[PDB]
Hints:
This is part of a larger assembly, with three copies of chain A, two copies of chain D, one copy of chain F and one copy of chain G.
Chain D: H1 14-24, E1 25-26, E2 29-30, H2 36-55, H3 63-82, H4 84-93, H5 95-105, H6 108-127
Antiparallel strand pairs in D: 1-2
Chain F: H1 4-8, E1 14-19, E2 24-28, H2 30-48, E3 56-58, H3 67-82, E4 88-91, E5 97-99, H4 100-121, H5 127-139, H6 144-155, H7 159-170, H8 175-188
Parallel strand pairs in F: 3-4
Antiparallel strand pairs in F: 1-2, 4-5
Chain G: E1 2-8, H1 29-43, H2 48-53, E2 55-56, E3 60-62, E4 68-70, H3 79-84, E5 87-89, H4 90-98, H5 103-112, E6 116-125, H6 127-130, E7 136-145, E8 150-156, H7 159-175, E9 189-193, H8 196-202, E10 208-211, H9 219-225, E11 233-236, E12 255-258, E13 263-264, E14 272-274, E15 284-286, E16 291-294
Antiparallel strand pairs in G: 1-8, 1-9, 2-8, 3-8, 4-5, 6-7, 10-13, 10-16, 11-12, 14-15
Helix pairs in contact in G: 1-7
Amino acid sequence: YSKIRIVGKIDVLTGLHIGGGGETSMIGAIASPVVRDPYSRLPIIPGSSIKGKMRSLLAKHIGLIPGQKMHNQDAPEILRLFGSSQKGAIQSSRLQISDAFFSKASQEEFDKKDLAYTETKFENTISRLTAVANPRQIERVTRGASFDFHIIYNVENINEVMADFENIKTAIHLLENDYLGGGGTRGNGRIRFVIDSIDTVVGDFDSSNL
Amino acid sequence: YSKIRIVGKIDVLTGLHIGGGGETSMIGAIASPVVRDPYSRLPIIPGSSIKGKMRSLLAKHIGLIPGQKMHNQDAPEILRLFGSSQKGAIQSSRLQISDAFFSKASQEEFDKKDLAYTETKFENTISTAVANPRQIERVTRGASFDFHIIYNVENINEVMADFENIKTAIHLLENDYLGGGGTRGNGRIRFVIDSIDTVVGDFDSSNL
Amino acid sequence: YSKIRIVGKIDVLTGLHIGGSMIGAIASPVVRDPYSRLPIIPGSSIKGKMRSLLAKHIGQDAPEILRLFGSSQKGAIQSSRLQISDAFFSKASQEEFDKKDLAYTETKFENTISRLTAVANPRQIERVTRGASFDFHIIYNVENINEVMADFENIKTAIHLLENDYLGGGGTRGNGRIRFVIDSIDTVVGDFDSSNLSIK
Amino acid sequence: MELAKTKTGEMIDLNFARKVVEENKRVIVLFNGLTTSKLRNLLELINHVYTKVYNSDDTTLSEDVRDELEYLKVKFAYESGREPAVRTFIEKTYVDKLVDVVLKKNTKKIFLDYCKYFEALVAYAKFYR
Amino acid sequence: LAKTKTGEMIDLNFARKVVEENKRVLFNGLTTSKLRNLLELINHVYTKVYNSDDTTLSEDVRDELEYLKVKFAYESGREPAVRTFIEKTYVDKLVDVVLKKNTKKIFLDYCKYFEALVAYAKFY
Amino acid sequence: FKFELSNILKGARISVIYSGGDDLFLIGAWDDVISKALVLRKAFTRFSAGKLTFSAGIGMYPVKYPISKMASETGVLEDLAKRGEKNQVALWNDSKVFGWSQLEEQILKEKMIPLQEALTNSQEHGKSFLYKMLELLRNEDQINIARLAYLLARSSLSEELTQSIFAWSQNKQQKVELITAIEYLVYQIRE
Amino acid sequence: VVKLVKLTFKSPVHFGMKRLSDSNHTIAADTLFSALIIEALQQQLELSHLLNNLVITDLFPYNKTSYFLPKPLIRIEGYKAFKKLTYIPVENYSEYLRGEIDSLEASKIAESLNLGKASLSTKVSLQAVDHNGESEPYSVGNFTFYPESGLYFLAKGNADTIGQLEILMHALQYSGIGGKRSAGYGQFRCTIEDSGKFDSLLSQTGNIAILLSSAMASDEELVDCLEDARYLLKKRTGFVQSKTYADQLVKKKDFYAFSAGSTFYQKFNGKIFDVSDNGRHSVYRYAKAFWLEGKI
């Protein structure tokens, strides 16, 4: 059994809004807060968010089967990578994304220059008939922030590791070109995967090529 | 699935003002500050503003349905371009207009010329003939912001129509204003496209 | 017969949702102590995760797996060497969370973008908050002295995998990253020596 | 809640916020003509420091937060001078006194409670209108 | 910010104290327009410092503050009430203190003190 | 409990698993089960002319939930309903133990039906407003009363209903009933 | 040498009834004795002391204040409160025997029992999932004792037997008791000491005798004991837990023993009953009787 660890950081570009738990917000405060790590009250990118976004992008790039409804109806490569739950064909997810926590380097860079990690962005919604605007305060992570992301790939078939990591690179490229969060079509969620340190944490497998 | 990137610059003509909602301001100054990128403390045109203004202008040009109440009731092409949230008829937004950050070339040009990126226009409101002083922070004329628009090829055959709609929306936005205070002049802007390239997929962007 | 006590902490590196209701509320509440309501890690979950990871490492029908985690097969009845008790929310972590007034468990809102209608189905999953430490107590049974070194090497491999592989929950989506800290390893019963033995 | 006591002696809390809003409710002009936008401006002045403290976890109020609270007192005085209705609102609700009280106490909890009191004031002003 | 006579510290509460001490009319006849002009003089350099990211006051900002001192002296000459306001509020010395500090924080503290002066003059 | 129990449950989607001398256990549609429990209580009062009363437990489970688990949890609910004051029904969670008249009228008639009327009549409201109300009512931070007032003020609902909701929220033994009514309504109006 | 052994359970315990889902507050004497025999087999201690000189008592609840004993089965003159009542504190035991306890007092005593909270943990088996199958859900009952509460039992035996019992209980602290042990249940810490209150209570002479353990008389003494007896014949059965008994798990011979609290006018000395048939070793079912005399 081999486990390959991909440790790096996701650098925000336009500022991503992964919406939080929708807790009771103060009147006039952020109507839609970001998901934050409760222990440190720092914004994070959940591993579920990255995993779902990159899986959907990879499925679209490969091509959804006509009339696809369930996630288990994806292409066999996507099912092999991100896992399946179809009864009698449960494939283990080789990719185990982890929540991308606010990096200490970017945290210190924000402590300097007296910058808040999350910025409240004001938006409105012009009505189609009355032309009235409805104010909205959305919390968004600052553009200069960075989140240390941690992925683990499980080597289930040594022959398919190359193909799976090629699919991973394609999905990462798609996610860099696409957004990661809410409101990306309005410009919230652009990112890039700058640092990538692929090392075999467990096993005799060689990840230098990967 | 092809992601086509439209990278260019957007340059203000009369002074852009996208407000930030007010902030801690000394008496008689910074009445309505412009929205700024928190990291660089630099003026920014939000992608939300550009996308919303283009969608509204395209809706007006195509023609709103009588008694329209929600943005999910626009023309089918507009809904396929800018997205839809209708129950059972969700349409993915092919246009992913992003925040138009202040271009480094224009920023260095302003630094060279010793000019502030934003002008605090001092205006009032005559009533009794009693004025109401106010300092609106609007982007200085001649400031270029780099705009980046992602178009997703959901349907190959519809790409030409969608890009014609995008061109019409850009034409309207250049003809109309952006941000707030357009009727008073501030907010007129111009697009200068650099290159349309299909970063992802096999689609060809040379024709586009 | 010798019994080796292994007392340590499980540090939740990323929100742990073991799981196991009201409308608009947490539909997947984590397991909690029925009296104290503190979230706990069932010993069954730790034992099963370690068994599965060690099975993948060895490959369960393997004699090492059966001897370590118990077997009831015809002709192969083996008492489980590893008695992994439920990990309880540690008092130190409880005090740390009481300070700053932080909830022991967070309600994480997630959704499900479908492939057909693109609509989102929302869920609110409870997860033990990151930074929480669970006091885990394990008893190893020395049925054969010659097998102790091999069994502890297998336990070390399983613990390494469990530090790299999530604990119970949707860990492929991030919920369940943990780290093991081995506070002590003592021989409560018997004359066996556990000084050389190390889980990590 | 448990912020301070008025000059008459009535305790100050969310219930006191509702009571003072009801008392100044006149038919519906509230606090002698206080428009909603003035109250929202005061609420945003509150909300700046509220966000600054809500992100932070320190029990004691940070020095920048205390300076912003004193500047908040200054802005309250300026709004009182500029608009009589805002002056009446602040006097009846004793907001400025609560700001100096939270400055004296120097606790995150007491500041959050004061922000909750102001939020209750705004909410009941919107409700009783 | 700075230390006044008898250990008093320049502060917004000190601004209120000065406004209530000089209240009788304010500052022996000071009007709102003169204080407004002084605040306008503050506003330009305040905005210049606010836009600049550097903590240390820029050279042009320091020269602007020196010209602010000159203009304060000229205003004090033009109107005795403005001179009384300046000597009671110690604003002219505060500008020199800010220049000595050469820090954005001290400049914004002085600007907030002047803003408190204006606000309390309007309130009283 | 053999013949008239069958007469009472005529059109309901209910299967009576058993009905002894006093014990009764029936599984059906959740809304049908609650409604027929109320009707059974009323008919029991009519037949017993006051005098005898009965206490019940009602539980809501998924369809594929094990029968043994449903029976055990409902028995626990009924045992809690018997505890202290009898003639009580423990609806859903243990927190919602209510009197029969309280559940039939003070919750469904008093609170659930007006909320249903408002939500069906309002063309600018939906389940989102109900869930926001539910979150504000269940937060229990002593401040959410004001936020609920603000939400109702912006809601453009009925003035009488708005005042009634605010009054119910401000007082215990009525906030829980309003929560129960909202939960019942959102359960009812699921897709 | 009577020794009270208190057990404080760090982890929830199964103590399951015939169903795995079912959870019981306590266990009978046969279960604890089987645990002791298993421990002696593991520790390689001689079983003669346990089989001959050791007399134990059913594990019983105890709270921060009082120790609980099983409700004696005696004639009572609100019977439902008494029937639902199961455990009576030591001080109230004599009063209950005399009959001074009334229905309201019986309900108050039944409410006074703060032993713990019974829950049903829901678990799954993923063994089939790897083999192209599906997860199998199951339920394990458990009883989380309140921090001050626990389970106590009295053990009467010779000094050597008491020392062997101390060693066995020290090992059983980590071995655990009840069901689903080695799967996160049954861990406990035991403290064994002389109990003055129980030494005084046991040293009583009464017209009636109350069983403190699941016991069954031999065929010779059953004729003498069964007369004028109020008892509850509880069915003790289960599977054999050992590696050498058979190649596969085999049920023990069905046994029926008088439950704790059963009252017999004539005492009987219980017998260790062998419930093993066609097995490589013998399975001992503890039915030795621990008696408490009382006047009614």
